[PDB]
């Protein structure tokens, strides 16, 4: 169906997914001058100690690293969240050039890429149920800039060659997502949506202020993936990011300063 091309990209999504023009769409630009510190925000708690990765796959839009979410072995809580959210998967959005790639932007600045760690509200029983709730998901967003290599990302990079085309997957166990986090947990938060169809407005966004650094060698590997399946014409998987959407009547709160 949809994609990131000129004929099926973000500008076309609204036809099959009318909520694309909704009141709480993501991503959005973060204006640091208007996103003010909220002294009522509680400390963010990221507990990934017992994370249990299962596999990594190419869904034709990006690559997902799936986790076993049967227990509270990897959860996100605190911050703006009411309750506990279980980690189910993470994926990235990146560009064809270093100057673009992230979905969220800070004072209009675009980063080379953006990592999204997806979690669902345990009060709803399972992911399917949660996604149809305004407070069903919590996505932790982390910016990536090019510089020093990120050791915690190498395990991922080293297996991308096995899932080059759409539809391929491979077992991916013992991956520790803690290796993808920056030093600081300072963040900005606002009510939003999934950034890809169905674009459901069920997400509480938590975007970290501090980006992590990854090497050019690492980003280059991401850019070698393909949107296409095995056999069809090669279509490099690059620029799989949705542009900033209107903030509308929303507020972006800062956990710091
Ligand atoms: Xe569904
Ligand atoms: Xe990347
Ligand atoms: Zn995403």
PDB file of N, CA and C in Angstrom, residues 53 84 205 246:
ATOM      1  N   UNK A  53      15.032  -9.814  23.402  1.00  0.00           N
ATOM      2  CA  UNK A  53      14.802  -9.647  21.974  1.00  0.00           C
ATOM      3  C   UNK A  53      14.523 -11.008  21.350  1.00  0.00           C
ATOM      4  N   UNK A  84       2.374   1.620  33.682  1.00  0.00           N
ATOM      5  CA  UNK A  84       3.563   0.950  33.154  1.00  0.00           C
ATOM      6  C   UNK A  84       3.416   0.556  31.685  1.00  0.00           C
ATOM      7  N   UNK A 205       4.420  10.904  23.327  1.00  0.00           N
ATOM      8  CA  UNK A 205       5.805  10.974  22.887  1.00  0.00           C
ATOM      9  C   UNK A 205       6.769  11.493  23.940  1.00  0.00           C
ATOM     10  N   UNK A 246       1.509  19.624  11.807  1.00  0.00           N
ATOM     11  CA  UNK A 246       1.065  20.774  12.609  1.00  0.00           C
ATOM     12  C   UNK A 246       0.871  20.436  14.085  1.00  0.00           C
TER      13      UNK A 246
END
